[PDB]
Amino acid sequence: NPLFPTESAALTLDGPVGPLDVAVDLPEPDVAVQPVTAIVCHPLSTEGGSMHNKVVTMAARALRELGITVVRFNFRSVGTSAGSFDHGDGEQDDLRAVAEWVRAQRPTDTLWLAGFSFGAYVSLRAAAALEPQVLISIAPPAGRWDFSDVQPPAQWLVIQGDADEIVDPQAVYDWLETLEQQPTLVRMPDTSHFFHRKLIDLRGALQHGVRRWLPATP
Amino acid sequence: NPLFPTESAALTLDGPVGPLDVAVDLPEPDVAVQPVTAIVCHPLSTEGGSMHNKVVTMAARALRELGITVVRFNFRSVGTSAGSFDHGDGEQDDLRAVAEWVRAQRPTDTLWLAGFSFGAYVSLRAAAALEPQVLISIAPPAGRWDFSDVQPPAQWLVIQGDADEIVDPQAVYDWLETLEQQPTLVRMPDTSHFFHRKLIDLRGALQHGVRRWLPATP
Numbered sequence: 001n002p003l004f005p006t007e008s009a010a011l012t013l014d015g016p017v018g019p020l021d022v023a024v025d026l027p028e029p030d031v032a033v034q035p036v037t038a039i040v041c042h043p044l045s046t047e048g049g050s051m052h053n054k055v056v057t058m059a060a061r062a063l064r065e066l067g068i069t070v071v072r073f074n075f076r077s078v079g080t081s082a083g084s085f086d087h088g089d090g091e092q093d094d095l096r097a098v099a100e101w102v103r104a105q106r107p108t109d110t111l112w113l114a115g116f117s118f119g120a121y122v123s124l125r126a127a128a129a130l131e132p133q134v135l136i137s138i139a140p141p142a143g144r145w146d147f148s149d150v151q152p153p154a155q156w157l158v159i160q161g162d163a164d165e166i167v168d169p170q171a172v173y174d175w176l177e178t179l180e181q182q183p184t185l186v187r188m189p190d191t192s193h194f195f196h197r198k199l200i201d202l203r204g205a206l207q208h209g210v211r212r213w214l215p216a217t218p
Numbered sequence: 219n220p221l222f223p224t225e226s227a228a229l230t231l232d233g234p235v236g237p238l239d240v241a242v243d244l245p246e247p248d249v250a251v252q253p254v255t256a257i258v259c260h261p262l263s264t265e266g267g268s269m270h271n272k273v274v275t276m277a278a279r280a281l282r283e284l285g286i287t288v289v290r291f292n293f294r295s296v297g298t299s300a301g302s303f304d305h306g307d308g309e310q311d312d313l314r315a316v317a318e319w320v321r322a323q324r325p326t327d328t329l330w331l332a333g334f335s336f337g338a339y340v341s342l343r344a345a346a347a348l349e350p351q352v353l354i355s356i357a358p359p360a361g362r363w364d365f366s367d368v369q370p371p372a373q374w375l376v377i378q379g380d381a382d383e384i385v386d387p388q389a390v391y392d393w394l395e396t397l398e399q400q401p402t403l404v405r406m407p408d409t410s411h412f413f414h415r416k417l418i419d420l421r422g423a424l425q426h427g428v429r430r431w432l433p434a435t436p
Contacts, residue, residue: 030272030417054248065418197436199248200283218415 004105013073013101016093018082021074023051025060027067032218034067036133037102038112041095041119045078045085055116058199059138062206066214068112073098075122088118088145092126099130110215114138117167117193121145127152134213136206137183139164139193143171156183157209159202161191184209222323231291231319234311236300239292241269243278245285250436252285254351255320256330259313259337263296263303273334276417277356280424284432286330291316293340306336306363310344317348328433332356335385335411339363345370352431354424355401357382357411361389374401375427377420379409402427 002011005024013020027033040063042056043049050056051072060070075091076083083090099111114136115123121141123132128151135156140147144167158176162169169187176182186205191198220229223242231238245251258281260274261267268274269290278288293309294301301308317329332354333341339359341350346369353374358365362385376394380387387405394400404423409416 028418030415032415197248197250200246200436218418 002101004102012080013098015076015081015083015097017076017090020076020081020094020097021051021079022098023072025064025070025072027069028065031065031067032216034214034216035109036067036112036215037069037071037106037109038063038114038134039071039073039095039098039102039123041091041113041115041123042072042075042078043117043119045075045091045118049118050074050078053116054199055138055195055202056119058195058203059114059116059136059206062203063112063114063210065203066207066210067216067218069106069109071098071102088122088125091118091122092129095122095126096130099126112136112210117141118145121147124150124152133215134210135183136210138202139167140172141167142175143168147175152181152183154181155210155213156181157186157206158183159186159188159205159209161188161193161195161198163190164193166193220319222320230298231316233294233299233301233315235294235308238294238299238312238315239269239297240316241290243282243288243290245287246283249283249285250434252432252434253327254285254330254433255287255289255324255327256281256332256352257289257291257313257316257320257341259309259331259333259341260290260293260296261335261337263293263309263336267336268292268296271334272417273356273413273420274337276413276421277332277334277354277424280421281330281332281428283421284425284428285434285436287324287327289316289320306340306343309336309340310347313340313344314348317344330354330428335359336363339365342368342370351433352428353401354428356420357385358390359385360393361386365393370399370401372399373428373431374399375404375424376401377404377406377423377427379406379411379413379416381408382411384411 074081113132120137292299331350338355
């Protein structure tokens with residue numbers, strides 16, 4: 001039903017269990033546009049997670065500044081997205097609905113996926129089915145969620161705060177060191193789970209990390 | 219008459235020859251605030267210069283992201299600022315009026331000055347009288363304006379596009395190599411006068427260049 005906007009806008013999309021709050025942010029003005037649309041997933045719904053989370057919006061801004069159109073959305077039960085928290089299972093289906101709408105509305109773009117904490121778990125688990133060109137995981141919650149039998153794309157970036165009190169950095173590293181295809185990893189010193197007073201540093205890490213994967217020349 | 223705003227706002231200030239258009243942009247949210255207020259001067263009034271110039275606003279954004287409050291304004295004859303172009307002379311007085319208002323309204327802050335092209339000429343010439351803590355010159359128009367007998371602060375940053383068609387980069391370098399106290403210089407390759415598709419690079423150069431001069435720890 002919903003139309004992909006040509007001006008930054010908020011809209012509602014039909015999800016597997018009802019309406020989903022969606023926000024489409026157009027790329028930064030005066031920057032070479034990229035034939036890419038990225039979806040950014042938010043952290044735990046049962047806690048402080050939504051499309052408005054500061055880490056989520058800075059990740060979105062970081063990509064927009066590179067000429068990428070960004071889509072944010074609320075998982076079921078958050079904001080006015082219908083339904084109830086489903087521990088990452090039904091949330092993968094919510095993500096699929098958004099991804100399929102993006103691909104239908106922007107058939108000539110490629111798809112990038114990113115997520116913070118719980119959102120990183122959902123996007124990583126959904127990677128096999130959605131086949132993104134680029135995957136970005138901010139504070140993947142290793143040690144709490146199951147990352148087995150996942151199939152991320154070759155171009156995968158992981159950013160982790162080394163002073164994260166929620167996600168054990170060492171748990172993340174212990175997991176990454178066992179993978180056959182190790183993703184680019186940026187360890188941010190003295191950085192907390194929500195990158196307090198480190199959002200600008202996060203922006204830099206994301207931009208430098210994905211720079212060479214931009215399909216078009218900035 | 220005018221009050222320093224506590225929310226980003228546009229206001230009018232009494233200048234030496236009449237009203238001056240002013241804009242105050244508050245610092246980026248979720249970033250350590252700095253006890254600094256910076257004024258950014260625009261390029262040639264007789265051509266494409268105003269508080270809305272893209273280079274001027276990106277310079278402003280670059281500083282705001284570091285926790286600095288930024289003030290932009292239109293020189294006489296531009297926008298609704300009264301008066302007529304005075305080739306950089308009366309414009310120094312316009313800048314002084316803004317600087318004096320800032321210092322009166324924010325007595326515990328220090329003052330930073332920045333300018334692009336013509337704006338760099340005016341702020342550099344006004345440095346002796348205004349004694350800024352930091353001076354930033356973007357594309358100082360060496361070769362066209364007189365930079366003799368100027369007294370910039372010790373912390374001075376110069377950013378120059380190396381493919382500038384308006385300002386001869388070599389004229390800038392030939393001038394800088396004769397100074398007893400050489401300012402930090404960032405030469406941006408294949409960059410035009412208005413930093414076309416290089417605004418993000420400009421942001422990075424400015425932020426990295428002034429980082430160590432921030433009075434407070436980010």
